[PDB]
């Protein structure tokens, strides 16, 4: 609905740095590199091609929304989320600290205060341990 649609859009915007309405191969590599990824031009093209329906070389919102809306198999969704947690959890200690959430949020271009980040940790931190564990990430991610 309008909400999840708008969520997906907001996400789209993390990618479309220029706000031209499309994610080019360069914008994809930018966001990826931010998040500790280092794809080669080749990979980036293949990646953009996988979802470029109109063969126009770039990925627009409805091509993204289409990707983002595809039915992910349960066992697959779980896997997708584990992989996502692993992007936040840089030290790989199975817990997402405020330091890590700050890095990710900042690399993604997102602008928040140390208080806001701490808030995000706070809201997601059900077991009040100062950090976000896997089940907390999942509880928050769904």
């Amino acid at each position: 609905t309008e909400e999840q649609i708008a969520e997906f859009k907001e996400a789209f915007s993390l990618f479309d740095k220029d706000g031209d309405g499309t994610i080019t191969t360069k914008e994809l590599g930018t966001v990826m590199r931010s998040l500790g990824q280092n794809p080669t031009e080749a990979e980036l093209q293949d990646m953009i091609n996988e979802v470029d329906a109109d063969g126009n070389g770039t990925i627009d919102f409805p091509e993204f929304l289409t990707m983002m809306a595809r039915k992910m198999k349960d066992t697959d969704s779980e896997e997708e989320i584990r992989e996502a947690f692993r992007v936040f959890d840089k030290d790989g200690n199975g817990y997402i600290s405020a330091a890590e959430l700050r890095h990710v949020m900042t690399n993604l271009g997102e602008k928040l205060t140390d208080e806001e980040v701490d808030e995000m940790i706070r809201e997601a931190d059900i077991d009040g341990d100062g950090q976000v564990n896997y089940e907390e990430f999942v509880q928050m991610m769904t």
Binding site: M47, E110, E123, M140
Partner: peptide
């Protein structure tokens, strides 16, 4: 949590694409 959702989607968008 809208900051979480939004961000999680983006990180997920990369995973999907990485296939």
């Amino acid at each position: 949590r809208r900051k979480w959702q939004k961000t999680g989607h983006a990180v997920r968008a990369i995973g999907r694409l990485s296939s």
